[model samples]
Each structure stands twice: as structure tokens, then as C-alpha cells.
Target: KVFGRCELAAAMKRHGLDNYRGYSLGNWVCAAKFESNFNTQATNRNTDGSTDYGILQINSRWWCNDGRTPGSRNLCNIPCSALLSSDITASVNCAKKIVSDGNGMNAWVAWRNRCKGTDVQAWIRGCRL
Candidate 1:
């Protein structure tokens, strides 16, 4: 499952999001501007040994770095996915479990509210833990 732009877009649609995390499509465009510059292939450089992957800024070294099925999933620490895997989606599911596991639409609304018109840090902070 090549989770490239098309796949990501499809996932958004399935999740009922017209934009990233339900932020205005424009807002999402901007986030992409800075975060990954819209590049899904972007990987993080770790001074230590941690290697990150994917557009959502997933840390592969911690999660899917080894891509093993067992404990390597790092279903706890991993946050993103760049390898066309639904690991990022799974992480979001984990997030939902932490809270009320909001409906996709509701989660989308929350993302938009937290992200728009606020500093990125503020946006990050607004996320329901």
C-alpha cells in the first residue's frame, strides 16, 4: 500500500477530512510548507541513533524503524510514518484512546481549532492528550 500523496489524501477522505487534521485546507498547506515542505520522503536526522520517518514526523527508530511486527511497533513512542504505512493513522488511533477517541470529524475540528491562528507551539499544545 503505497501511502503516498494519493493514499494520504484517500485516508483523509475516509477520515472525512478535507484538510490536515481538519484544519482549513489552506492551513494544512501552510503546515506542509514548514513541517515537511510537502515532502513525504522527509526523514529526521538524529544526533543519537534515533531515525525518524514520514510526513507526520514519525520517529521510525523508536517505532517502525525495524518494521518488526512485535514490540518493534513502538505503538507507544512512535508518532509518524513515512513509509506508506498506516502507522501514522494507528498513532492517531492511540491518541484517541488517550482521550475520548473522538469521531473523525470531531477530531478534525479540534485539530483545526488548535492549529489555525495560533503559533505552532500553541497548536501543538492545544492537542488533547
Candidate 2:
């Protein structure tokens, strides 16, 4: 499908999340939806005057826009997401790798709790999504 539906769905499936486990893809459709709507060719606003980028909707103008190298085209601008739309490991794993070396789950759990004012990472940990 040329990195379209099948590729996206397949990527998600690899992480045991065809349904966006703990992500509510069925209900929320994962971050890719809001971040880029799963469009590799997606684009968003930049800082100065540039525009139009790729999935994850990263702009070449701003810093966080392009997940790739800094201001290059050949780079993975979107990094892991640029590689595969369904890579939760890329998403959460990357998040974990950065935040706490895989222990980032607690931070995420806390963040999610903070979002809802619900402190239950310990309780929620064992509860499957």
C-alpha cells in the first residue's frame, strides 16, 4: 500500500496495539492522529516563514517540527514515526529512553494521572489498556 493503511495498521499491530492499547486508538486514534493524522507528507506551522513538512506534521522552520537532523531533508525529520506509523515502541520507547531509560512509564503514568487528576500509576500498571 506504499506506506499507507496496511503499513500503518501493521506497524501498530507489531506493538500489540492494532487498537492503540493504552492509547485508545479506537477512541483516540493515537498521537499520530493529532500530531500528523498519520500523513507522512503532512505539514504544520513554522516559526519564521517556512512551512510544509511530513508526518508528525513537523515544520522545517521550528525546532521540534522536524524530528530529523536539524534542517535537512534527507533526515528522518520525524525520526521513528517517519520510519513506521505503527511503531509505539518508537513513540513510547523513545519517550521512555529519553525520560527514564525505560522507567519513563512512571512519568507517563504520572503525567496521565496529572491530566485527569488521578494518581493511580501503581493501580493502573497492572490494568491492561
Candidate 3:
């Protein structure tokens, strides 16, 4: 699903992620931008042979199953395909669970590398939320 950056942030905030795990709304906004450009159906094949799925680019290695990826822990017990959708309910919920498990944004390398030291407010700039 295609969505504006602000729209994605708003949805995330509505899902109670504005300050989840000490991560700000801007953090999520920025991560989503780099992870999938807010495209819910986005998917990327990593050089490590694992595939990332959905707007949050939830990894198949541990979070979800693609029915073909080897060694998937399925920690989230969700089908990786479910993360790819116009409806972000599943992805956001899964993300919350992921961060709560003590990994925080470390689960997303994009967040650690890009959003970590930047002025994240720019990510939420002009958003009413």
C-alpha cells in the first residue's frame, strides 16, 4: 500500500507508538522511510539470503514465515506476507511486540544507522499528529 510519510506517522501514533520503547514518532517515520518508503507491500532480499517484508520490513529470519525461507524462528507467529498490506494494523502491532522484547529499534538496522543520530523531527515535519 502506498501512503504519505505523514499518514504513516499518524497511523503509528494512533496505534500508540508515539513514544513506544523510548522511540519517538519521528524515529518510526524515518525507519519506515528507509525500510520500505511507506510501501506496505515492499520486500527486499538481503545479501544474507533472508528477505525483509512489509512497511516495517519485518525480517523473515526470526519474525515471520514466507513458507520457503530456511531457519525462520517465526517469533511473531505471523506470516511474513501478512505484513505486506494497505492496512498497517498487523505490521505496527508486530513492531510493537518486536521492540518490547528488549531489542528496541536495534531490530531495524535502518533505524540504528539513519534515524539514530539525525534530526528526526524532520521526519514528522508538517504532520498534525
Report lDDT (CA) for all predictions.
Answer: 0.42, 0.37, 0.90
Q: What is the TM-score of each candidate against the true structure?
A: 0.39, 0.33, 0.95
Task: Score residue 16 of candidate 3 by CA lDDT.
Answer: 93
Candidate 2 residue-wise lDDT at 99: 38
Residue 14 CA displacement from its true place in model 1, Å: 3.6
* Model 2 spans with C-alpha error above 4 angstroms: 1-7, 16-21, 27-30, 46-54, 58-129
Distance from true location, Cα of 75 in model 2, Å? 16
Q: In model 1, state the lDDT of residue 5.
A: 43
Write down the TM-score for model 1. 0.39
On the 0 to 100 scale, the lDDT of residue 129 in model 3 is 85
Top TM-score: which candidate number? Answer: 3
Clash totals in order: 2, 4, 0
Whichever of 1 and 2 has more TM-score, that candidate is: 1
How would you encode candidate 3's per-residue C-alpha lDDT over 1-129 as one tens digit per residue?
788988898999999999898898999999999999899999999877789999999988888888878876888888999999889998999899899988789889999998898999899999988
Model 3 is weakest, by summed lDDT over 10 consecutive residues, at 67-76
